[PDB]
A paper describes a structure:
The cryo-EM structures of the [name]-[name] complex bound to its native substrates Gln and Met are determined at an overall resolution of 3.2 Å and 3.1 Å, respectively. The binding pattern of amino acid substrates differs among the [name]-[name]+Gln, [name]-[name]+Met, [name]-[name]+Leu, and [name]-[name]+Pro complexes, despite all binding to the unwound region of TM1 and TM6. On the other hand, Gln substrate is stabilized by the side chains of Ser431 and Asn435 in TM10 via hydrogen bonds, and its α-carboxylate and α-amino groups are positioned closer to the unwound region of TM1 and TM6 compared to Met. Neutral amino acids containing hydrophobic side chains and charged side chains might adopt different binding preference in [name]. Despite variations in substrate specificity, these three complexes displayed striking structural similarities.
[name] functions as a peptidase that regulates the maturation of angiotensin (Ang) and serves as the critical host receptor for SARS-CoV-2, while Collectrin is a homolog of [name] with a similar tissue distribution, including the liver and kidneys.
Residue numbers in the entry:
A (entry chain A): 130 to 267
B (entry chain C): 130 to 198
C (entry chain A): 474 to 542
D (entry chain B): 140 to 273
E (entry chain A), F (entry chain C): 612 to 749
G (entry chain B): 342 to 408
Amino acid sequence: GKVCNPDNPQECLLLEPGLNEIMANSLDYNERLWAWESWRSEVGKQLRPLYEEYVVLKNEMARANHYEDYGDYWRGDYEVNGVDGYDYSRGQLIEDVEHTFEEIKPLYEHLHAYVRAKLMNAYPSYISPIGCLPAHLL
Amino acid sequence: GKVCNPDNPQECLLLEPGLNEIMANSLDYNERLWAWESWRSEVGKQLRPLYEEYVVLKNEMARANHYED
Amino acid sequence: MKKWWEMKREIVGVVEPVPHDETYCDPASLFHVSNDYSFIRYYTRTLYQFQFQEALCQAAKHEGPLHKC
Amino acid sequence: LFNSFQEPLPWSDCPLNENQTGYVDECARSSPVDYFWYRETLNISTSISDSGSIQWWMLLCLACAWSVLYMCTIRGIETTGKAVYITSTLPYVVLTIFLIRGLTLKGATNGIVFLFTPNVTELAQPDTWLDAGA
Amino acid sequence: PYADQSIKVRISLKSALGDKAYEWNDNEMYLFRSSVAYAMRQYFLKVKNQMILFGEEDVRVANLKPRISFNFFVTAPKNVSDIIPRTEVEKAIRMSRSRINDAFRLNDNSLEFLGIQPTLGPPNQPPVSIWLIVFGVV
Amino acid sequence: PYADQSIKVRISLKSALGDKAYEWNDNEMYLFRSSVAYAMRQYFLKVKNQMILFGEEDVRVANLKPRISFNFFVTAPKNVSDIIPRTEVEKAIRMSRSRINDAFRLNDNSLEFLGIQPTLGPPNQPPVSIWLIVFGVV
Amino acid sequence: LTLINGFDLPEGNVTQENFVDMQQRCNASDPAAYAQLVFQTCDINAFLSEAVEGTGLAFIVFTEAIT
Ligand SMILES: *[C@@H]1O[C@H](CO)[C@@H](O[C@@H]2O[C@H](CO)[C@@H](O)[C@H](O)[C@H]2NC(C)=O)[C@H](O)[C@H]1NC(C)=O
Ligand SMILES: *[C@@H]1O[C@H](CO)[C@@H](O[C@@H]2O[C@H](CO)[C@@H](O)[C@H](O)[C@H]2NC(C)=O)[C@H](O)[C@H]1NC(C)=O
Ligand SMILES: *[C@@H]1O[C@H](CO)[C@@H](O)[C@H](O)[C@H]1NC(C)=O
Ligand SMILES: *[C@@H]1O[C@H](CO)[C@@H](O)[C@H](O)[C@H]1NC(C)=O
Ligand SMILES: *[C@@H]1O[C@H](CO)[C@@H](O)[C@H](O)[C@H]1NC(C)=O
Ligand SMILES: *[C@@H]1O[C@H](CO)[C@@H](O)[C@H](O)[C@H]1NC(C)=O
């Protein structure tokens, strides 16, 4: 998939070279916003009807295997059965993930607040000091 | 300038190869109509604002040479 | 997409710069999502990586901070 | 009676001030009928100790009322006895029309009961009996 | 990032139409967006004497709800980073409001725009002050 | 090649509005095209139960004139060779005509469609045949 | 109107019969946004007691009903 300028529609950009290096190097709010939104509207729009079908098919492929869905199929890699105390059931992984993540939130909030205070000196008048971070500046 | 399919938007066609050989070989009314109308709407639309200016400039270049236009 | 951009604002702390209706699919434009890969290994790998590191200098009898082990 | 004979009745909507975008504050905080009564007809003041002009637009109505009254009683009997035929008859027709129009509204038969539900704790005050006698 | 140039819209069908009220599907949001684009086109031709081809894909909509209230803002034709300042959208609508009300059969109390209020008309009724004429008459 | 699926439209402003008539610039052809696209969207959702995204670039217009009469036809969304057969356009319009008339303030004699004529209403007035009641009355 | 403007409830869902139930639900859902709203407390058989002043009945209520 490729994206091209609104001004000169004859130069189109792939992602691996070209669209990545804009997002990785540029410091121009408008150019980053263009690249960000354009990659999602030009190529995200194509993938939606296919993803809605991939979901449905993968779910049958899993239910026909004595699983609940494809999710519970993927978590099947962390499961142990009948070894006396080392057992681990596919439903525990969600508890462990959600319970270890609540101990990181304190550190991530400070790291996130520190970055916000330092982007406001690179793109002033675009970031509010009590809000989130715009997604195209990260 | 290049043109690409409405179905698979990831295959675009230039004119010198590709869009010429459709018009020169195909016998499918719908494919010919697609190629024809698409080349004019994708690339004719870009050239109109430039042609309107080229006309004006060339006319001055001629009137300054003791011609009418 | 409504839940996607609800969870982004609440967990990650990141907001989108233009609103996105239900004709988009922003997660599908990521390499792992649109190539059918499991994504959790990158979570648990991060924690094992430091559990191993911390339980290994204590065998090497470390002195100071962990990050100078 | 004179301010009728016009379809946008004067007591139906508020007037606009000098800046013709917002209502007059007196007519905004209250009803337009209260405004037409208290400000456009009476121009009432704030206390009994504040007398003002004579307000010509009431002198005309007062003079018309007294002139009509003097016209009808120019000679006592033999002249009022000719006007009474209409004067004491028209009300009993207009009132029947208005009763028929009133008993078919929304709040009718819901506001009449308030008139006929007495409270036995009010009959023991001297004020009510004095007012009934008066 | 876009919430200070947005306008709020609130629509109350079952009040104005009472019944007979159509149902508000997506083909109504389409008509609404294109009518707003028409209003913007007119404002930039009889005030600023430019000619800009706004489309229905330049009206962005957010936070749809059952009350039938949402937010919208407008961008330049193909430049996603160019948000028309809200104070000009508030003029385009003040100009073409009577025509937007008609496309839907709403009447300025069922199509509130939350920030732009109706004004037009002074009470220049009487050239005669009928009451004194009745006075003389009798 | 396209003249047997076209519909003719004739508009008479100074008759209906009398005066107050707006001027018919291109921002009116835009509104007209998008209102026709809305009508087509509705017809294919409450008759055929499909969902097709007609736009204002799928309504093709020909032979504009001062009388304000032109021709138009409709194509599938992105398939220039697919002309919706005229007999279905004549139904979509019969369905949404009362709503197209409003967007412009015309009234079914100033927005003739030349091939689709108005029909709706029988004279079911009298439940009493007042005349014999007056008869008895006297 | 105030209630449905607060929580953005459908137009034809909040009526006279089930008003208290929807009020209770909208409070128990989001106490903050509900508490900051302003309500009017007024009931029938309580506007009938609005005392009409002297000579202010034939000109205040009858004209208001005739209009
Ligand atoms: C899209 O619109 C933006 C405005 O939002 C344009 O950005 C301006 O660019 C010029 C020169 O490139 C700068 O002088 C201005 O300061 C920019 N605007 C702001 C608000 O800073 C941008 O040029 C437009 N893009 C196109 C292709 O026209
Ligand atoms: C565009 O629409 C045309 C119809 O006008 C489609 O052409 C049909 O194609 C199928 C198979 O390709 C044939 O069986 C039909 O006979 C064609 N129609 C006619 C009238 O002959 C065409 O497929 C459409 N293109 C796309 C990309 O959907
Ligand atoms: C009317 O407009 C003027 C400005 O021309 C302003 O000063 C005045 O306050 C306005 N009137 C009201 C009641 O707001
Ligand atoms: C109403 O009274 C005030 C003060 O008594 C006076 O200034 C005003 O002119 C009066 N109204 C009219 C219409 O004269
Ligand atoms: C009001 O909306 C709620 C939302 O779920 C619904 O359950 C309820 O039935 C609605 N009220 C009526 C009267 O239908
Ligand atoms: C709203 O809900 C809170 C929840 O505890 C309750 O304490 C409060 O009394 C309620 N108030 C109203 C007005 O419903």
